[PDB]
RNA sequence: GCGGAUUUAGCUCAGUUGGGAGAGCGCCAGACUGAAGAUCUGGAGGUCCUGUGUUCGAUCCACAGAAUUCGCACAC
RNA sequence: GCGGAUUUAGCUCAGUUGGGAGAGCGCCAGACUGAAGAUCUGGAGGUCCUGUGUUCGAUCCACAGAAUUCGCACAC
RNA sequence: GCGGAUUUAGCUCAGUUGGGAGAGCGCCAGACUGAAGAUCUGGAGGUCCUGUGUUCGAUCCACAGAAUUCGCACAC
C-alpha cells in the first residue's frame, strides 16, 4: 500500500537495558497517530515460549513506524552475549541505529562488542539514548555516564561527541501510551524523549537510497507454513523487487536452484504490488515450503547471479587492535564466512605466494565454502571465526 | 460370530493311513447337528490338482468344527516323507493332536518321525485312533496291533500306555455321514468309534489357554489373492486381535516393515470383530498383495517386536540319542532356524570360548540369518539341518 | 486406399544435372491425368530454408506417382559430394533407378561416385535420361555423350550399352506442366521424352515382389511430431503390415525396444488400413514422440529379430579396383556397418587364425557394434569407413 | 504350497566316475613401437554358489540352503 | 536431416608446424611434528577422445566415428 | 531461530585428567588341509568428525564448524 520514505535501523545495546521496551515506545508514541502506526506491544515481540520464559530476546525482532516525514524499518536486536549471531545479522539488512543505553550501569561487555560489531560490520551512523533514567537522579551521574558513551563510540571510529544522547525511559514513556493511547508530543515529558530521539533519527540519518534495476535477490532473512496456503520468505530485498505471480528461484544454501511462483507478495501484513529496494518485503511461493526455503539463499527470478562452492577475493585482515585475531593461520584455516543473510565456514587456500596471513595484513587468496552460495565479483563480505571478526574482503573472482 | 472354547489340534500319521479322511468324519460326525459344522469333505480338502492327481496331502490343510463342550481348530498333515516341513509347520500352530494310524499296517517310518517330530516339537498332548480296523479282524492282531503304539509313544516320552487307543474306521462311518447327513451320535457304530476319539479329545486335551494382551502379531500362516480386493494372511495369531482397518506392519522375511489396513478380518471365512488369541484368524490388508506379504512375516501393528539379522542365543543340541546329529559342528555351520511360522538359515558363530559344539551338548552362542526376523528374548525357537532337528534353544539375547 | 503395382525407384546423379527437377516432371507429366497424381513442384521437394537457400538438395526427398500399369515410389537423391551419406540411405530402401546425367557436363565426379555406389549397393536396374538436351545442339556432342555413359555403366558392371538413353529435358518438359497443367502424352514434345522415360521404366524395371509373411519390421527411414497427436515413422517397411492399433516395439539404437500403439497409420497421406510389402508407409504411435524414435531402429511388434551388439559374420572386402581399399586392416579397426536404414561404428575382432585382412580377401570374423541392434543370421550387411565402401558381408551368426 | 532349470576365472563358455577344472576375452609381463594400436612368448587369477553328512580325502555323491529362470497350482 | 563448439594427468586449466605435452590441486615420498594440519625438496601419473589414411614416424594433417554444448530446420 | 544427543580402526563397541586409544569381526600372514571351511600364533590398519585458540605439546580443554538423532518453538 505505498506512500513515504522507507528507511532502515534499529536498537542495538547490552542485555537487558533495553532494546526490547524502546521498540513498542514507536509504534505508540509515533502510533498516536497515523493508523499504519499499530500494537506492538512488548510480550507482543518476545512472542516466543522461552524468550518471554527467560526474560530476554534471542530472537531477532523487527517491528516498524513511521514519524511524519520518513517511514522505518526498525529491527530489535538480542543483548545476551549468547546471540549475536542473530544481533549481527539484523544490523546486516539495516543501516544506522539507536544505540539501547541503561543510563543506570553505565556502558558494558555488549555495550562495546556490538558498538565494534557495528563499526566492524561497517554500521552508518548512531545514536545514543540514555534510557532507564527514572532510576537515575543525582545528575553528576546522568552527564558522567554521557561522557563515558561519546568516549567509547569514540574508540570505535565514531561520531563520539558529534553524536545524540537522548537521555530518556522507555518504560514510562510506554506505560502513558497505555493509558492514553492517543497522547500527542509535547503532551507526556516521557512520550517527549522519545521524540527527541525520532528528532535526531530524522536529524542523524541521512537516507536509505539503492536501487531496484537489477533483478530478483532476496536475502532470505525469514520462513513459515503461514496456515492454508504455501510459505513466505520474509527479507529486506536489496535490488529486484516482486510482483506477485514471478516464476522464482532460490539460489544458495540448498542443492539446485529452486524453481517457484511469487503467489503471495505481502509487506507488513499489508499486501503490496511488488515490494522494492531495501523495502522488508515477504513473499509466498507456488511449490517451496519451509522444507524448501531456509534463511541465506536468494530468491532470485531465473538467471540472476549464481551460486558457488570456490571463488577468489580480495580480503583485508584485522589487526588485534581491531578486536581481529592476534595470531596469524595459514591455509587450511576454516572461518565461516557471511553473505548478508547466511554465514558459511569455508577452507581457505592461501595463494601460491603468501605463507602465513597475519594481524594487520591486508592480502588476496582462494576459499572453498562447505555449501554454494551467491556469488559476484565485488561482492564484499565478512569473516568471524569463533567467537570474533578477523577481517573483511571482497570476492575479486570466481572459480566454481 | 463369537460364542464357544477355540481348543487347537490335529491328525498327524504316516502316509495313507488316514489323516485326511478321519477329518471329512469330523465336519459330519459332530455336523450331523450345529449349522456351523458344514461340508468338509475328502477331496473337498485335496482341492489341489497334483494332491488329488498323486493321491496325497503334500499340502497342509485345516477344517474346524466343535464337539458340543469346546470348539475345535482341527489341522490335516501330509504323511510322505517328501513334506515333513509342511506337516512341521502346522503342528507348531496347534497344541495337542490325533495320532492317525493304520490298525492294517502297524506303526511305521513317519509314524515315529512324526509322533518324534511331536516329541521335538514339544506337543502337549496325542490320542491314537487305531484305524482302517474294518480291513481287520483277527482280535490277537488288534490287541497286539496296540502295544506298539503304546511301546513306541512311550519311546518317545508320552503316557505311553495311558493314552487312548480309540480303535476304528474312518472310511465307513464317513460313508455313512453320506448316506445319513444328520445321522447322531448312539447311531452308527461307525460313527460311535469318532466320538469315542472325540470323547478322548475333550477327554485328553485339557486347554489352549494363552492372552492377547500384547500387540499384533501375525504368523503370516497363509496367503492368496481374493478376487475383487486385496489379499487376505490366514494364521493362528499368538498375541493380539485385530479390528478390521487397524493400521498394520509386516516384520519379517521382507525388506522393510510393510504397513497397511486390515480392512479385511474374516474368520473361518465367517467375518468376526477383531479375532483374538490362537484364533487362527484370517485378515485382507490395503496396499499389501501377495506381492507384498508371504508365510513367514509377522503382521504386527506399528511397533510391535523389531526385525533382525544377529543375535544371541541359549541352544540345547539333542543328542543322537534323541534324533540329532552324531557329530559336533563348529563356526561356518548354517541350519536353517525355525521361527514358528517360516525357517531360515543362519550361520553359526561359535562364543570366543568354545570351539565344537556336539550331540548332547547344551550351549550358548551367535547366530546370523540370510534375511530377517521378528525376535525377542525369551522367543524360544528350534533348529533343523539337512533330514532332521538337531537342537533346541531361546533367543538369550539381540545383536542387529 | 489400395489399387495398383508399387514399384520402388529414383533419380541419382551429380550435383545439379537434375536429379530434383526431373521429379515434379513426373508428379506432372503423368499428372496430367490422374487425381492421386499431386502437386509435386520444384522447391516443393527442397522445403528446407537451407537447400533453397544453397540451391542443391542435401535432405533426401521422395514424391510418389503412377505411370499406367504400375504405380512408383519414386525418390530424390542430394548430388553434392559432402550427402552421399543420405543419397546412400535411399538407394537401399529402391530397386531400380534413374541415373540423371547432364547432356552438358558429360559425366562427372558423383556420375560414377553413384553409379558406383549403386554397383556397390547392389542396386538391379539404371536407365540414363541424358538431360538439359535444350542446352546441346551440336548432335555430334548428344551421341559423343551418350557413347561416354554407355562406356561408363560398362565400367560398372552394368547393361552398358544395353540400357536406355532416354535424351531428353527436365525444365521444358516442366515448364509446359506448368502452363498446360493436363497436357497429355503425345502433346509436348518435352513432356514426350518424359514418357518415353517411363515406357523405359515399365521396360526396363521387372517387379518390386516381395513377402509380408514374417512380422512388424520398420526401417525406420524417418521421424516428426505432426502437430495435434503424437510422431510418424515413415519407411518402406520390408516385410510386415500394420493394422493402426499394432501394440508394437522400436528394435535398435534406443536402449530398450521401446513399445507403443500404431494409433496413426497414413501412407502418402492417404490413410490405408494396414501398409504391406515395401510400401513406403508411414505410422503414428501411442507413447513415442521424436524422443523415443530415430532414423535406424526397427519398429517391429514385440518378438520380432532381436537387438544385438556383439555378432559375427561372412565378409567379402572389396579389392582397391572396385573402389575398397588398398591397405589391409587388423583387428581394432572401426568402420561404421550400414543396415539398411542407420550406420553404426563396430569395432572389428579377426578371428582367432586371421592377422591381416586385405583387400580383395574375403573372409569371416566378429564385430562388436557402439550400440545395439536388429540382427539375423543371413542379415546381409555393407561396409563403409571414411570416405568410402570397403567390404560387404553377411550376419553368419550371433554373440550378444 | 509344489515341480524343472541353471549356478564354475573379471567377461563369455568347457569339463568330470571323489585324488582336487580348461579355452578364448580380457589382465599384467617380456620382445617390437618415441608412444598407441596390431603381433609374438610368457605369467597371474577359480573357496568349481553355500553348509553338513559320508570318505583317508568332496567341484563331483547324499542330505540340507541360496540366487536367477521357465512352469503348477491355490479369507486364493 | 543440417551447422558451430569442445574433447588433453584423478580435478581444474596450458600448450603445438608431425620427432611424440606443462602448470597449479590433488597423489605418494623424504625433512620437520608424538601425530595432524602447515611447509620444504623430490617422485609417479596422460593410449593428447577413437579408427583408418598419408608419413620413415601422427596429440597435431586428411578421411571417417564418438561423447557433451550452443544453434537450423523439418505422416514435421 | 532455540535446546539435548552422538560423532573413535573397513564393521560393531571400549577407553581418558593434554605426553598422543583397545577389544571382538573382519583383513593379510605363518602352521595344519590337495583345497575350503574350522583352529593356532602373529601382523597391518585410527588425521580419536573439522578449524582455530591456549599449551612446550591437543583425542581430551576453550572458542568456533559439520554430519546424523530426539525435542522447542515460530507473511508461522
Ligand atoms: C553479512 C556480511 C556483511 C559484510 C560487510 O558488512 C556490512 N557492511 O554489512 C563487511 Cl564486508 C563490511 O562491508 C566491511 C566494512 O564495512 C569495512 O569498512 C570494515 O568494517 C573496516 C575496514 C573495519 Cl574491519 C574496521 C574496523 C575497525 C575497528 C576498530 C576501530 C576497533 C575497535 C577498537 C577499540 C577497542 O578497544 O576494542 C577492544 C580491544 C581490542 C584489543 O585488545 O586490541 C579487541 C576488541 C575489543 O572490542
Ligand atoms: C517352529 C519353531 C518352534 C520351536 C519350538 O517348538 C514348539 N514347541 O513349537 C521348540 Cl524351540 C520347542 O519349544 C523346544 C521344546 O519343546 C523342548 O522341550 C525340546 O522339544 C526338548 C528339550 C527335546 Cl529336543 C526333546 C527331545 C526328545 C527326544 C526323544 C525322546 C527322542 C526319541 C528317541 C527314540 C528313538 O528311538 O528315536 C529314533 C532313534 C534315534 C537314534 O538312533 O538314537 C534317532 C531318531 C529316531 O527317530
Ligand atoms: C544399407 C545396408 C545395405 C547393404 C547391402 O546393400 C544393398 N544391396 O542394399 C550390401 Cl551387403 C549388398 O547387398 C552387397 C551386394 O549387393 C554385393 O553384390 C556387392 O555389392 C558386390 C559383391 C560388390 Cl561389392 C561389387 C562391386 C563391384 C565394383 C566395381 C565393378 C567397381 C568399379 C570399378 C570401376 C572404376 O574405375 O572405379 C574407380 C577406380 C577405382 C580404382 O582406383 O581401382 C576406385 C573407385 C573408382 O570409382
Ligand atoms: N526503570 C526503568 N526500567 C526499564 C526501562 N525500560 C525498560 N525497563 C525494564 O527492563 C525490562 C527488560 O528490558 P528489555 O527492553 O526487554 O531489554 P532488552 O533490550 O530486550 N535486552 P535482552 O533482550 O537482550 O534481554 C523491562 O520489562 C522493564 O521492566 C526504563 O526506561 N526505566
Ligand atoms: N479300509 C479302510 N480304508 C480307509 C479308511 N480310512 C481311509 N481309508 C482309505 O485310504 C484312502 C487314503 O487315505 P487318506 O486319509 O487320504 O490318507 P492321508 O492320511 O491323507 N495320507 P497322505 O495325505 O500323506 O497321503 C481313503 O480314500 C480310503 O479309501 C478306513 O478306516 N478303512
Ligand atoms: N537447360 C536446362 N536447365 C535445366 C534442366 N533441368 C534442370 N535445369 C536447371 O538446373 C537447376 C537445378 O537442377 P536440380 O534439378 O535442382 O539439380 P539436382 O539434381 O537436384 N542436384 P543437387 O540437388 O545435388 O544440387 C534447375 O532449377 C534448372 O534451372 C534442363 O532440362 N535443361
Ligand atoms: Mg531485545
Ligand atoms: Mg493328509
Ligand atoms: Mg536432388
Redesign the pocket.
Known amino acids: 500500500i505505498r506512500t513515504k520514505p522507507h528507511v532502515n535501523v534499529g536498537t542495538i545495546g547490552h542485555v537487558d537495558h533495553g532494546k526490547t521496551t524502546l521498540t513498542a515506545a514507536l509504534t505508540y508514541v509515533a502510533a498516536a497517530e497515523n493508523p499504519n502506526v499499530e500494537v506492538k506491544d512488548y510480550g507482543d515481540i518476545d ?4 524468550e518471554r520464559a527467560r526474560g530476554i530476546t ?3 525482532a523487527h517491528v516498524e513506524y513511521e514519524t511524519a516525514k520518513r517511514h522505518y524499518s526498525h529491527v530489535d536486536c538480542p543483548g545476551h552475549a ?2 549475536i ?2 544481533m549481527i545479522t539484523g544490523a546486516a539488512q539495516m543501516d544506522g541505529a539507536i544505540l539501547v543505553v541503561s543510563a543506570a550501569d553505565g556502558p558494558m561487555p555488549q555495550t562495546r562488542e556490538h558498538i565494534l560489531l557495528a563499526r566492524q560490520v561497517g554500521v552508518p551512523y548512531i545514536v545514543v539514548f540514555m534510557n532507564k533514567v527514572d532510576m537515575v537522579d543525582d545528575p553528576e551521574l546522568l552527564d558522567l555516564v554521557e561522557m563515558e558513551v561519546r568516549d567509547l563510540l569514540n574508540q570505535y571510529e565514531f561520531p563520539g561527541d558529534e553524536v545524540p544522547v537522548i537521555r530518556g525511559s522507555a518504560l514510562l514513556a510506554l506505560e502513558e501510551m497505555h493509558k492514553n493511547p492517543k497522547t500527542k508530543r509535547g503532551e507526556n515529558e516521557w512520550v517527549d524523549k522519545i521524540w527527541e530521539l525520532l528528532d535526531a533519527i530524522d536529524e542523524y540519518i541521512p537516507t536509505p537510497v539503492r536501487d531496484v534495476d537489477k533483478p530478483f535477490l532476496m536475502p532470505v532473512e525469514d520462513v ?4 492454508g ?2 510459505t ?1 520468505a ?1 527479507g529486506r530485498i536489496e535490488r529486484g523487487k516482486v510482483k506477485v505471480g514471478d516464476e522464482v528461484e532460490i539460489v544458495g544454501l540448498a542443492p539446485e536452484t529452486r524453481k517457484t511462483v511469487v503467489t ?6 499489508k ?1 503490496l504490488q511488488e515490494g522494492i529496494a531495501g523495502d522488508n518485503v ?3 511461493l507456488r511449490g517451496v515450503s519451509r522444507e524448501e526455503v ?2 541465506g539463499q536468494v530468491l532470485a527470478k531465473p538467471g540472476s547471479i549464481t551460486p558457488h562452492t570456490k571463488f577468489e577475493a580480495s580480503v583485508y585482515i584485522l589487526k588485534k587492535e581491531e578486536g581481529g ?12 564466512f557471511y553473505f548478508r543473510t ?4 569455508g577452507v581457505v ?2 595463494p ?1 605466494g603468501v ?2 596471513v597475519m594481524p594487520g595484513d591486508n592480502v588476496t587468496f582462494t576459499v572453498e565454502l ?1 555449501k554454494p552460495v551467491a556469488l559476484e565479483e565485488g561482492l564484499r563480505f565478512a569473516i ?4 570474533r571478526t578477523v577481517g573483511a574482503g571482497v570476492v575479486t573472482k570466481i ?2
Not at 224 to 227: A, E, K, Q, R, S
Not at 264 to 269: F, L, S
Open positions: 512472542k516466543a515460549p522461552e534471542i530472537n531477532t549468547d546471540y549471531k542473530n513459515f507454513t503461514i496456515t496456503r504455501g513466505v520474509t503471495g507478495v505481502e509487506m507488513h501484513r499486501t515477504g513473499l509466498l531456509e534463511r585475531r592476534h595470531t596469524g593461520f595459514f591455509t587450511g584455516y576454516r572461518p565461516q547466511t554465514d558459511v565456514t587456500r592461501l601460491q605463507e602465513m562447505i568471524r571465526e569463533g567467537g572459480l566454481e
